[PDB]
Subunit: 259 residues, 4 copies
């Protein structure tokens, strides 16, 4: 039950949320994992510990993904620790809601530096280091293409940008035999989801009980449940298999068919 | 190396081409396979034989997919033979080129009966029989969304229709715990490819040597090679795994990043 | 205020609904209009009368769009009456809801014959007759790409097919200097909307008062109102202008930004 | 022949290229135009002069669109000069080709500051100032969604981002009665096209004669010709008409059906 045995994965923002779920599912299948974290050092070591309990190797490495020089440092350290890399999961990100009239250059820069520029440099580093048969997977969101959501231009734009990076990088990574895809999840139970899901729930309002949100979202899902980090980690695991080689340069929505 | 052990798959038009590649890759991973064929009985038994050599169980069952009553019969027989079904691969199809002015109702009907109606009924039968955790996968083509291709409205329209079926059926199959996706391949080495690839090759013309076509197409691929039935079968295998559960209602292009 | 002066338009199913709104807006701008109708003869003559009151010329011509030979007859008569054609609006269509398990070949055929095959032949006739600078516009629906709607595979698939026709026909009509686009409306106040809108309203149920439906849909629209046939006719008018020449082979959603 | 009579338009980067073509076509139809320019002061005054010869009013106003405070200043001046605004055309942009490994933070920032951040602030200013019935139109490119193009991640990503802004801003501008759309042109004869078109021509190479490029691109167009700034200006003119009100939150490809 170890299709990824002998491979090395790097996941940005793997200390918690989706990042953690991806790190765990990759490790459960044999991959050694570099658990990057921005500031959640304790959560990251906890993930390394969870990996160990699953028989997987891992290492927590701090790096501020919104700073390109730190992304380069992160990769240098990861390669120094595990000797090479195969899979790169660009996951770090932030939600953001703001009246467009109130958006300042500072807020704009903060959002794009992490959500977009950070992913560009993580992808550049993947092109630089990923071994043949490798995989680079960026993170967009269904919000990049959704309609009817207000005060969300920074988030929608920063995620849509990454979809353009995916198609470009797939061409650029071809000679190296590394595929590049982009995942676009629907709602997934995490801290970000608990803070922002009301904006997506049918009839949602600020202050709506989380259980009601969860129920409204699950009811809009063909599978009648909300997604969890493990659902994303399992799908990413499948994309990391040799079997997924012919899937390249694609934006894949991971929604269970819901929202 | 048997993630699909104990599962039963049905593949329409599995006697040759992509269908055969899908049947073989599913069987290589543990699935028992119903090899449907329209008229290629000998190729189909050959596939059943190849499956046996891989340690997989298979059975060839004739059914004209362009006739709904025969699709229903095909499923009844498949269920009678293997006791149930988990994965349904709707693959049968035909290419078609025609000056739009020259298209007759008869040609229109012939194309849609197989490429579209056939897939609708195969999907209906999947909803009717697929067990929980099951998978239904329809076959479109990148030609459904390509621009610049002449005399191809019947093929483009018949394939685009199936993408609408995919989103609809995903909602309809949810309660049963069966996901529904659609694959849209780029060029894949088969009889259809050898007869029709010139239409897609850059600078292609009728009569262009097949080796030149192959070289032109491979050069337009990031992976620097053309796709083969095994590439499609491997990707479909990954989609049939439990790990792919959160991918639902999606049209996934299988192109290696090329055309 | 007559940008379409001297041009001749043919609109299928122009006796009522969206078709009527398109016929009226084209005539208001100078076009002579062939008002096709399947069985609503009285509504069609009413439209011809409304056109006359606007100073536009029109003629009602019966033709069952689900029968290719009648589509050919319709065009022969239209050309006999006005001497040529410039704009072809393929609008006739039907909604359809059905448990996929209950769909029969007869229902399938009925839906595709009108919604898809009919549009293919109307487009073929446009290629055959449209004068240089002409326009062919097909009708899809946002339902072709929507997710989360149950018992709707026949409608979603029959409309998605037309999007493939649009891209194909644009290539095929180029030499003749005729552009081909496809409109995909959101909800538009008509008989079809009054019978089917509950399926699209947030929290909709069969039996929900139409005023509540209208209010729920309008609230989901940035423009805070539901669309009407005139909104569609105005947009189609703009697409029929010489100014729209560079828009070709596109599926354009006409939703006011809503649903 | 003045559908836009009495309206005021602002076009970023209107001194030359597509921007100039848009300014001229809007003015030809009655709009007073604010011709913004970054550094081409002489070209901009030339455009103001061309507008005058067409009987349209115009004013050249310098503003570096890559600097948000200057975008705000540009709008303050435009409103001071013409008393209000109706149409905002966000057009300024740059092409960029670079081996992804060689991209520096400085290059990244330069590209996104103009192509993406600049458009966000132009859109914010449109929301702030556009009168009811107004229009905001952003500029993407078919390159945002194209496959097979190397060394182009910064351009593809910076343009794809704007498509996300379009959907978001359409929701945000609804209450004010201002629609927001995004145009995605194919090749259009301009300085940028003459410097970069080889990258898009079938079989293109650096150093390919421009006439051969033009011929190769035109041959890939259903209309058998390359697009020009006037083609874009005419389409934008149609989108600025009252008739286009129901088209909102859409990315419209302006390609004549080609590349
Ligand atoms: N949850 C959902 O429903 C959806 C989420 N997404 C996307 O999935 C990704 C993860 O989301 P989710 O897990 O829910 O997010 P959470 O907010 O729960 O956690 C986000 C992660 O981003 C990391 N991170 C933030 N800033 C930095 C930084 N500057 N440097 C390095 N790492 C950083 C965080 O780690 P740290 O604490 O150390 O800073 C954390 O691990 C994001 O890109 C998000 O936009 C997309 C669709 C849906
Ligand atoms: N090859 C390519 O590059 C691409 C192919 N596709 C699609 O993939 C699918 C398979 O293509 P490919 O393998 O290349 O095709 P081939 O023409 O090589 O074989 C097609 C299959 O369809 C089956 N079939 C045809 N008619 C019927 C029928 N009436 N009833 C039952 N089965 C039937 C054939 O079996 P039999 O001999 O018994 O009739 C055959 O197994 C098709 O849907 C095609 O449109 C999509 C994109 C690219
Ligand atoms: N209303 C909405 O919200 C939306 C509608 N649409 C599409 O827009 C189009 C028009 O919709 P709408 O006006 O609301 O529809 P209605 O049901 O109100 O009217 C439909 C039209 O189709 C015509 N028609 C039906 N069958 C035939 C036939 N066999 N031959 C010739 N004409 C025929 C009808 O005329 P007759 O009475 O003579 O048969 C009628 O004029 C359809 O294609 C529909 O799917 C798409 C998105 C949204
Ligand atoms: N030409 C084509 O084929 C296509 C073009 N596009 C897009 O269309 C838009 C225009 O393209 P095109 O006209 O060909 O471009 P050119 O390079 O010919 O001209 C671009 C314009 O951008 C302006 N500009 C550049 N920087 C600034 C700045 N910092 N501040 C203000 N204005 C600035 C320039 O004016 P100035 O000289 O004063 O700096 C110039 O008016 C761009 O967004 C481009 O990406 C999209 C698809 C195709
Ligand atoms: O990007 C995000 C963040 C949070 C969230 C909560 C619920 C539903 C959805 C989201 N998305 C997309 C759909
Ligand atoms: O659908 C088909 C059939 C045959 C073929 C040969 C080469 C390339 C491509 C195809 N496609 C899509 C792209
Ligand atoms: O196709 C149709 C038919 C009727 C209808 C009523 C309300 C909303 C919508 C529709 N659509 C798409 C969106
Ligand atoms: O964005 C650009 C810039 C220049 C150019 C030249 C030719 C063809 C095309 C472009 N595009 C898109 C398609």
């Amino acid at each position: 039950s170890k299709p990824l045995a002998g491979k090395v994965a790097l996941t940005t923002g793997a200390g918690r949320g989706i990042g953690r779920g991806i790190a765990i599912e990759l490790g459960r299948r044999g991959a050694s994992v570099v658990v990057n974290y921005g500031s959640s050092s304790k959560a990251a070591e906890e993930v390394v510990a969870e990996l160990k309990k699953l028989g997987a190797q891992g290492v927590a490495i701090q790096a501020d993904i919104s700073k390109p020089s730190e992304v380069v440092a992160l990769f240098d350290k990861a390669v120094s620790h595990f000797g090479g890399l195969d899979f790169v999961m660009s996951n770090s990100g932030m939600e953001v809601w703001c009246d467009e009239l109130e958006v300042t250059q500072e807020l704009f820069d903060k959002v794009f530096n992490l959500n977009t520029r950070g992913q560009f440099f993580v992808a550049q580093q993947g092109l630089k280091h990923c071994r043949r048969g490798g995989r680079i997977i960026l993170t967009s969101s269904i919000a990049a293409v959704m309609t009817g959501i207000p005060n969300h231009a920074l988030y929608a734009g920063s995620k849509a940008a990454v979809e353009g990076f995916c198609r470009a990088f797939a061409v650029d990574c071809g000679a190296k035999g590394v595929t590049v895809n982009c995942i676009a999840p629907g709602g997934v139970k995490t801290d970000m989801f608990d803070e922002n899901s009301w904006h997506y729930a049918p009839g949602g309002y600020k202050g709506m009980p989380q259980e009601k949100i969860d129920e409204g979202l699950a009811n809009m899902n063909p599978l009648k449940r909300i997604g969890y980090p493990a659902d994303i980690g399992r799908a990413v695991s499948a994309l990391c298999q040799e079997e997924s080689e012919w899937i390249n340069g694609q934006v894949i929505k991971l929604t269970g068919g819901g929202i």
